[PDB]
């Protein structure tokens, strides 16, 4: 396989040490280690510190200049939907 692997929530929710920030947009995991050392402001600033309902329609260009393909080559895969916001049990009843 070489197209978006199903990572886990414990593997994404465990980047408190080391480097390479693992932010998430909606269902994709971003390893923006190249952006963390690009705009010295707070390492991970891809809308994921004070909440705010996801990152709106997308990333804002308020303090960005090269906003063209930063939310693509800075990704690694997706997150297992089983851990995302969906602990329901569709089907398996009728």
From Swiss-Prot:
<keyword id="KW-1133">Transmembrane helix</keyword>
<keyword id="KW-0813">Transport</keyword>
<dbReference type="GO" id="GO:0005789">
    <property type="term" value="C:endoplasmic reticulum membrane"/>
</dbReference>
<keyword id="KW-0408">Iron</keyword>
<keyword id="KW-0007">Acetylation</keyword>
<keyword id="KW-0492">Microsome</keyword>
<keyword id="KW-0349">Heme</keyword>
<keyword id="KW-0472">Membrane</keyword>
<protein>
    <recommendedName>
        <fullName>Cytochrome b5</fullName>
    </recommendedName>
</protein>
<keyword id="KW-0479">Metal-binding</keyword>
<dbReference type="GO" id="GO:0046686">
    <property type="term" value="P:response to cadmium ion"/>
</dbReference>
<feature type="binding site" description="axial binding residue">
    <location>
        <position position="39"/>
    </location>
    <ligand>
        <name>heme</name>
    </ligand>
</feature>
<comment type="similarity">
    <text>Belongs to the cytochrome b5 family.</text>
</comment>
<keyword id="KW-0256">Endoplasmic reticulum</keyword>
<dbReference type="GO" id="GO:0009055">
    <property type="term" value="F:electron transfer activity"/>
</dbReference>
<keyword id="KW-0812">Transmembrane</keyword>
<dbReference type="GO" id="GO:0043231">
    <property type="term" value="C:intracellular membrane-bounded organelle"/>
</dbReference>
<keyword id="KW-0249">Electron transport</keyword>
<feature type="modified residue" description="N6-acetyllysine">
    <location>
        <position position="2"/>
    </location>
</feature>
<dbReference type="GO" id="GO:0019899">
    <property type="term" value="F:enzyme binding"/>
</dbReference>
<feature type="domain" description="Cytochrome b5 heme-binding">
    <location>
        <begin position="4"/>
        <end position="80"/>
    </location>
</feature>
<feature type="binding site" description="axial binding residue">
    <location>
        <position position="63"/>
    </location>
    <ligand>
        <name>heme</name>
    </ligand>
</feature>
<comment type="function">
    <text>Cytochrome b5 is a membrane-bound hemoprotein functioning as an electron carrier for several membrane-bound oxygenases.</text>
</comment>
<feature type="modified residue" description="N6-acetyllysine">
    <location>
        <position position="14"/>
    </location>
</feature>
<feature type="modified residue" description="N6-acetyllysine">
    <location>
        <position position="5"/>
    </location>
</feature>
<dbReference type="GO" id="GO:0020037">
    <property type="term" value="F:heme binding"/>
</dbReference>
<dbReference type="GO" id="GO:0046872">
    <property type="term" value="F:metal ion binding"/>
</dbReference>
<dbReference type="GO" id="GO:0016020">
    <property type="term" value="C:membrane"/>
</dbReference>
<dbReference type="GO" id="GO:0005783">
    <property type="term" value="C:endoplasmic reticulum"/>
</dbReference>
């Amino acid at each position: 396989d070489k197209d978006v692997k199903y990572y886990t929530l414990e593997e994404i929710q465990k980047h408190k040490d080391s480097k390479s920030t693992w932010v998430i947009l909606h269902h994709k995991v971003y390893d923006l280690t190249k952006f963390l050392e690009e705009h010295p402001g707070g390492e991970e600033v891809l809308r994921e510190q004070a909440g705010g309902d996801a990152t709106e329609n997308f990333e804002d260009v308020g303090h960005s200049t090269d906003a063209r393909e930063l939310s693509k080559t800075y990704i690694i895969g997706e997150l297992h939907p089983d851990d995302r916001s969906k602990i329901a049990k569709p089907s398996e009843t009728l």
